[PDB]
């Protein structure tokens, strides 16, 4: 028990909706849809305990197409009229001892919200010991961490 591997499940992809009269004051003309590109946990658990930042690379026609999200939720909303590939770069907390992980997602606008989401698992083959303390102390634990006396 020198090295201990561990995985974390994630969901990545986008949702999209047709845009009506309700839109931001500076919504580019001819943009027909809004969309949210994201990296999430199952049950929308906050995944910032292992993810440090997510960097989304949009199409080069977008202003400042490299969008770095450095606090949760790891998502951004944009508008547009068409589909293209987005490069999602996931960076990990130091204790994970894991380099950047790349995903590529094709934005989906059709077919009334649409959802194009992919389930994957990030593996950490050589995390620091401290990584497991971070993981196990994340909110929501119900179990005892000591021998808790109890009646029959």
Swiss-Prot record:
Its main location: cytoplasm. GO terms for biological process: chromatin remodeling; DNA repair; DNA-templated transcription; regulation of DNA-templated transcription; regulation of transcription by RNA polymerase II; subtelomeric heterochromatin formation. Residues 1-138 form the YEATS domain. Keywords: Activator, Chromatin regulator, Coiled coil, Cytoplasm, DNA damage, DNA repair, Nucleus, Transcription, Transcription regulation. It is found in: Cytoplasm; Nucleus. GO terms for molecular function: histone binding. It comes from the Eukaryota. The keyword DNA repair applies. The keyword Chloroplast does not apply. GO terms for cellular component: chromatin; chromosome, telomeric region; cytoplasm; NuA4 histone acetyltransferase complex; nucleus; Swr1 complex. Component of the SWR1 complex which mediates the ATP-dependent exchange of histone H2A for the H2A variant HZT1 leading to transcriptional regulation of selected genes by chromatin remodeling. Component of the NuA4 histone acetyltransferase complex which is involved in transcriptional activation of selected genes principally by acetylation of nucleosomal histones H4 and H2A. The NuA4 complex is also involved in DNA repair. Yaf9 may also be required for viability in conditions in which the structural integrity of the spindle is compromised. Present with 259 molecules/cell in log phase SD medium. The coiled-coil domain is required for assembly into the NuA4 complex. Component of the SWR1 chromatin-remodeling complex composed of at least ACT1, ARP4, RVB1, RVB2, ARP6, YAF9, VPS71, VPS72, SWC3, SWC4, SWC5, SWC7 and SWR1, and perhaps BDF1. Component of the NuA4 histone acetyltransferase complex composed of at least ACT1, ARP4, YAF9, VID21, SWC4, EAF3, EAF5, EAF6, EAF7, EPL1, ESA1, TRA1 and YNG2. Interacts with SWC4. This is Protein AF-9 homolog. It comes from Saccharomyces cerevisiae (strain ATCC 204508 / S288c).
């Amino acid at each position: 028990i020198k090295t201990l591997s561990v995985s974390r499940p994630i969901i990545y992809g986008n949702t999209a909706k047709k845009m009506g009269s309700v839109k931001p004051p500076n919504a580019p003309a001819e943009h027909t849809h809004l969309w949210t590109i994201f990296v999430r946990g199952p049950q929308n658990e906050d995944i910032s305990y292992f993810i440090k930042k997510v960097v989304f690379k949009l199409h080069d026609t977008y202003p400042n197409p490299v969008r770095s999200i450095e606090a949760p939720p790891f998502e951004l909303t944009e508008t547009g009229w068409g589909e293209f590939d987005i490069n999602i770069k996931v960076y990990f907390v130091e204790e994970a001892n894991e380099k950047v992980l790349n995903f590529y997602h094709r934005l989906r606008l059709h077919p009334a919200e649409v959802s194009s989401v992919y389930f994957d698992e990030i593996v950490f083959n050589e995390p620091n010991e401290e990584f497991f303390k971070i993981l196990m102390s994340r909110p929501g634990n119900l179990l005892p961490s000591l021998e808790r006396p109890h009646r029959d």
